[PDB]
Write a protein that binds this ligand. Structure first.
Ligand SMILES: O=C(CCNc1ccccc1)Nc1scc(-c2ccccc2)c1C(=O)NCc1ccccc1
Length: 330
């Protein structure tokens, strides 16, 4: 089997991407944030505290004839950025772009934090990291990809995120027309439950490539590119007027200043992020100071190849016996 779904930016800044997902019988379609940095499929629901729902589409398990409650089961997640959610657990039929999994754990939110409430465009998350991170208790539940894997033509999914444009998540096949040149595959460590890999280095603009190992994760659920302070300082030093602002919580730059590209290494291959992918616009409405898309990982404790990086590439999440990651230019 295979599946193919369009993923769309939630706003003009590409802050996140949503993908339609069918849950239950008859189908209830919710727009979920596919997140390769976590492993829970959770949704706004009829059980969500009413004051914490503001415009989201909700899943109503009582109206699904295929929904089954896991009696006593709970889930609770705290994301790296402080946000959180928790609730109980059902199994139900879940389909993405034509690909169907029966018995998928659908985690119904009783509570969500303020950032989730304030974002009306995201109805939940669909985790695509390794299932060892899944928070369901007493029995850990598998991700949608893990459940579908055996049935897929090939045990893989791909992320093709657009810049200010729609893109595609494919399951079970590699669309050879979606990228240029070849796909370079690189080793993955699953020790932390992430699609964790080691980049071979970086360049800023037309500068010389610096060979250096950067361990980080391929994370579609994180907007920005978070790298070591030394690397980030080298990037913003090439931007006139750029400063790290303690009040804003990272690097900002004069909105009209030219942004150089940022190149990262995948083995001997190179992925080039165009300068404008790094522009996240005025820090507040009407300001001529703009937020930067490359930031230090020093406070986070882990380097993150988020949407800013991934959307410059066609990315293969290869779930073979020994998982690997593939990157191609496009
Ligand atoms: O990048 C984000 C959230 C992006 N989503 C978004 C939605 C609406 C408006 C704007 C943005 N948050 C960050 S920054 C850095 C991390 C992080 C990840 C792993 C480990 C340490 C830090 C996360 C994060 O927690 N991402 C998961 C997430 C969070 C909230 C919503 C969706 C996904």
């Amino acid at each position: 089997s295979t599946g193919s779904a369009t993923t769309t930016p939630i706003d003009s800044l590409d802050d996140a991407y949503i993908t339609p997902v069918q849950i239950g019988t008859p189908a209830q379609t919710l727009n979920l944030d596919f997140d390769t940095g976590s492993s829970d499929l959770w949704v706004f629901s009829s059980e969500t505290t009413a004051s914490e729902v503001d415009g989201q589409t909700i899943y109503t398990p009582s109206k699904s004839t295929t929904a089954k409650l896991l009696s006593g089961a709970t889930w609770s997640i705290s994301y790296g950025d402080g946000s959180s959610s928790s609730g109980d657990v059902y199994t139900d039929t879940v389909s993405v772009g034509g690909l169907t999994v029966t018995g998928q754990a659908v985690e119904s939110a009783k509570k969500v934090s303020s950032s989730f409430t304030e974002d009306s465009t995201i109805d939940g998350l669909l985790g695509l990291a390794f299932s060892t991170l899944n928070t369901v208790s007493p029995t850990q539940q598998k991700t949608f990809f893990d459940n579908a894997k055996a049935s897929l033509d090939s045990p893989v999914f791909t992320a093709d995120l657009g810049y200010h444009a729609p893109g595609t998540y494919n399951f079970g096949f590699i669309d050879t027309t979606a990228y240029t040149g070849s796909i370079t595959y690189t080793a993955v460590s699953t020790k932390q439950g992430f699609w964790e890999w080691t980049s071979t280095g970086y360049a800023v603009g037309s500068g010389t490539f610096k060979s250096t190992s950067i361990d980080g994760i391929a994370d579609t659920g994180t907007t920005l590119l978070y790298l070591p302070a030394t690397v980030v300082s080298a990037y913003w030093a090439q931007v006139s007027g750029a400063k790290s602002s303690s009040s804003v919580g990272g690097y900002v730059f004069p909105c009209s200043a030219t942004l150089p590209s940022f190149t990262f290494g995948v083995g001997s291959a190179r992925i080039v992020i165009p300068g404008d992918y790094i522009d996240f616009g005025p820090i507040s409405t009407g300001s001529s100071s703009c937020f930067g898309g490359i930031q230090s990982s020093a406070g986070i404790g882990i380097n993150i190849f988020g949407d800013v990086a991934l959307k410059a590439a066609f990315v293969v999440f290869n779930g073979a016996t020994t998982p690997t990651l593939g990157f191609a230019s496009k």
